[model samples]
Target: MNIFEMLRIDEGLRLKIYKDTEGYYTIGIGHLLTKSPSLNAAKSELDKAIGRNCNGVITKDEAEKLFNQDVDAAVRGILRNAKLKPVYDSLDAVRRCALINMVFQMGETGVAGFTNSLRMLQQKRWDEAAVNLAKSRWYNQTPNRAERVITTFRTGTWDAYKNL
Candidate 1:
């Protein structure tokens, strides 16, 4: 089975999860945002899904397919047309879904308002990408979760959250 098959995402839960979790900054499916009150579970829940190894190797092709097929469709429903295109353009597949997952966790407006970050991403500046990822209303909104996601993007590993 594919990763999606492993997770067994139903249409109803998919929509509910996407809508409920907008703009929360996550990775590895919808597993990483268990810290949210909206999510109503302990952070340990993600551990059940992702385990301890974050190989940083969800293949670009697989990431692209997953983003376009699953994540982007949700972004269409979750984001305004204006917000949709630019963020989509700025993100690579993993980053795309990661950002979309964040949008799903936080909401469209907060994700849209991430202007400076988007600008830095569009310019293909890597360090700026990490910094800008950290400077969100969502960042202040969820410091631990934000750091977790940002670390995933920057270091290509979820090991930063291993101890916690």
Candidate 2:
């Protein structure tokens, strides 16, 4: 529930097209438009999902719906995965949200690729799981977000692990 708000911060709502850190032409929270021809083309594709065009700017409701849908998919994805659901079920809401948050960014398959970290998490080795998280390229790419997730894993709260 609260994860969506955190996700909003993690992925700022954008009304227009902009290149993400990886240089993909993304709009609305982080909807990729790289395969599309233009921003308007992406907008046209988005329109089917969001209902219509309000000139060129994406409405907050429009942006929010996309995020909500993505988050739903991520959640369902976690449930569908045999490897993730059990470990996810063992965790509290905050930590579960951390995993969901990671899945939202990386997809279920991508997060599944963190086998060592997942194993540590399944063992309830909070610090070890977090340490494994730190050792990944995700930590190198988005240190703040990764650290925040690590903190959530360790303490069951987003800001509780304050080594910042």
Candidate 3:
């Protein structure tokens, strides 16, 4: 599936896919509209927006770039806003990335609304976080993705975010 197909940007919005002087492709809400699968950037942007870690790797200029950094920055910001930086730090990179991906895909406000879940995780209450996660609108809509993130978070697994 096309990566951007999963996301819902505003109506009549477009993606900006361009490379830096160094040739690393990046994307954001550009001034264009009337296109599908919004991303036309390097694979990195697609991979990151789609929740893939670059693993400190490299890709050919022809391949789409990964957007791991975008996800990273957004995820950190969300957790910080929630005062849940501890929770963000507790999980390994991949699991952390998963949570970040959730926030990125769902938006900061949507993830922030998970007050109970944030508290549960913050208090190291795995069972409660898991339960709260399952009860969320997020889980109600994206059960598979929600379950995967919850499972990784509950178990303290890093690869859950990366490999999955």
Best by TM-score: 2
Q: Which ranges of candidate 2 are over 4 A from the true structure? A: 35-41, 53-56, 160-164
Question: Cα RMSDs of all predictions?
Answer: 11.7, 2.7, 11.0
Report the lDDT tens digits of candidate 3 across residue range 12-33.
1224455422234434422111
Q: In model 3, how large is the Cα lDDT of residue 136?
A: 70
Q: Over the stretch 1-164, how does candidate 1's per-residue lDDT look in tens digits?
A: 22232122311122122322344423434433444654434333433433533232233343334444555455675455575576566656555545655564555766667777767656667577789887666688667767756764565443544554
Superposition error at 134 for model 1 (Å) = 2.1
- Look at candidate 2 and tell me the lDDT of residue 18: 73
> In candidate 2, what are the lDDT values of residues 1-164, reduced to their tens digit?
37777777777778887777666667788766565557677667666666776454687777887888888988999999988898799888889989998998877888989988988888889988888889988899989878787888888876733433
Against the true structure, candidate 3 reaches a TM-score of: 0.53
Each model's backbone clash number: 16, 0, 12
Badly placed stretches (over 4 Å) of model 3 are: 1-66, 79-82, 89-95, 158-164
- RMSD in angstroms between candidate 1 and the native structure over all alpha carbons: 11.7
Per-model C-alpha lDDT, please? Answer: 0.51, 0.80, 0.53
Q: Which ten residues in a row have the lowest lDDT in candidate 1?
A: 6-15
